[PDB]
Amino acid sequence: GAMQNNNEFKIGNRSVGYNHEPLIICEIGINHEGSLKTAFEMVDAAYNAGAEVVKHQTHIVEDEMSDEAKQVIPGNADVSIYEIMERCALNEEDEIKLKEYVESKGMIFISTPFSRAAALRLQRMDIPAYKIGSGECNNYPLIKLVASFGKPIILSTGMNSIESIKKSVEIIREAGVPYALLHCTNIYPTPYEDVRLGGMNDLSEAFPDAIIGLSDHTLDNYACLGAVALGGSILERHFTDRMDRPGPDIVCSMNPDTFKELKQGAHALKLARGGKKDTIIAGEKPTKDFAFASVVADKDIKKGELLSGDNLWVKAPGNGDFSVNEYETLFGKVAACNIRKGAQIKKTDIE
């Protein structure tokens, strides 16, 4: 039940929450490999595919990592995280041009700051909402800074327990900004078996004021579609204009075609999800009228004979005086006239 709720906030003019259309975040991330030309090509592909939001990563290497980062390699690469981020990072001027380009296509630009310096850059740019990546979910000092900007926060929760996340949510609530929690697994790519969609329920139950979604790094749309069925309001996958691009995140990115498929599926499952079993569906009425059973004579019954389980049965359609629900209530009734085998039992057939 927890995920079926009225929680909502706006990112600019776009309302997100269970009662709204799911929102797909196209995470270009570092997929541009440091090139504004490639980034624009990817923004073009997102726009033409029907995207509403393009998300960036804001990398200021000096403030985001210490020299130790030069000695440590990610699971999906063979060089240091420092080398990757130095290679892919857009400087401030280029990132400002990227935000302008995204907005010139009528889409929303948001980003993930990976540092204090990055957070401050985005505040100067006045972005409408902040994403906090799973690597920074336990970075309470950074979250406190970002929350002070007064914009909604979308918090990815991979690599963190509910217990760890509580401290971040406390900081966010204290700042008085609305927020979303995205369930996430940070393996690039993520196997289906590690997704644990049930994590979304767990988050929603622990944090009843949270908007809930999924950030994903599997190779396809199945996990995100499943998330929508569960009640997810925000979906995030990395995004590329084409799958032959180089880069460590390309492998789990969606492309224009698969984005379009996700948007279509998300809409269908937004419509199909939730609701209640007992809700009466007007469209079924012709089916109920022909398919439901009425009580019929199973033998010729003479006037004055007793109705029973031996001489009554039930058959479609549902327009007879007695429904199958009343079948046993007729036992012991007296035939008021001769009753023909196969005929519906009428109220006038009994005394």
Residue ranges of the annotated binding site for Mn(2+) are 217, 236, 238
C-alpha separations of 235 from 27, 112, 144, 259 in Å: 10, 15, 24, 11
- The set of residues, in sequence order, having a beta carbon less than 8 Å from that of 290 and lying 6+ positions away, is 316, 317, 318
Long-range contacts of 71-78 (CB under 8 A, 24+ apart): 74/188, 74/248, 75/187, 75/188, 76/188, 76/189, 76/248, 76/249, 76/251, 77/248
C-alpha separations of 18 from 156, 235, 263, 275 in Å: 18, 12, 16, 12
Q: Which region, judged by CB under 8 A, interacts with a second copy, from 35-43, 45-53, 97-105, 221-229?
A: 221-229
Q: Following DSSP, what letter does each residue of 223-250 receive, concatenated?
A: HHHHHHHHT--EEEEEB-S-TT--STTG
Tell me which of 243, 257, 343, 351 binds a second copy, using CB under 8 A: 343
Residue 347 in the binding site for a second copy (CB under 8 A) = no
Q: Which residues between 2 and 61 bind a second copy (CB under 8 A)?
A: 4
Site size with a second copy, rule: CB under 8 A:
97
Cα radius of gyration (the chain): 30
Q: Which residues between 122 and 141 bind a second copy (CB under 8 A)?
A: 133-136, 138-141
Q: What are phi and psi of 214, to 5 degrees?
A: -135, 135
The contact pattern for a second copy, residues 81-100, with x = CB under 8 A and - = no contact, is x-------------------
Q: Which region, judged by CB under 8 A, interacts with a second copy, from 21-29, 121-129, 252-260, 287-295?
A: 287-295
Nearest to a second copy of 100, 194 (CB atom): 194
Nearest-angstrom CA–CA distance, 274 and 71: 48
Alpha-carbon 90 to chain mean position: 30
The contact pattern for a second copy, residues 157-176, with x = CB under 8 A and - = no contact, is xxx-xxx-------------
Tell me which of 74, 150, 208, 304 binds a second copy, using CB under 8 A: 74
Tell me which of 38, 57, 58, 186 binds a second copy, using CB under 8 A: 186
Alpha-carbon 23 to chain mean position: 8
Q: Which region, judged by CB under 8 A, interacts with a second copy, from 51-59, 101-109, 180-188, 244-252?
A: 180-188
Minimum distance of a second copy from residue 3's CB (angstroms): 10
Minimum distance of a second copy from residue 12's CB (angstroms): 28
Q: Which region, judged by CB under 8 A, interacts with a second copy, from 30-38, 63-71, 93-101, 245-253?
A: 63-71
Nearest-angstrom CA–CA distance, 325 and 187: 56
Name the strand (E) or helix (H) holding 236. strand 234-238
Q: What are phi and psi of 350, to 5 degrees?
A: -125, 150
Residue 235 in the binding site for a second copy (CB under 8 A) = no
Nearest to a second copy of 103, 284 (CB atom): 284
The contact pattern for a second copy, residues 294-313, with x = CB under 8 A and - = no contact, is x-x----------------x
Residue 209 in the binding site for a second copy (CB under 8 A) = no
Tell me which of 79, 187, 243, 306 binds a second copy, using CB under 8 A: 187
Nearest-angstrom CA–CA distance, 228 and 223: 9
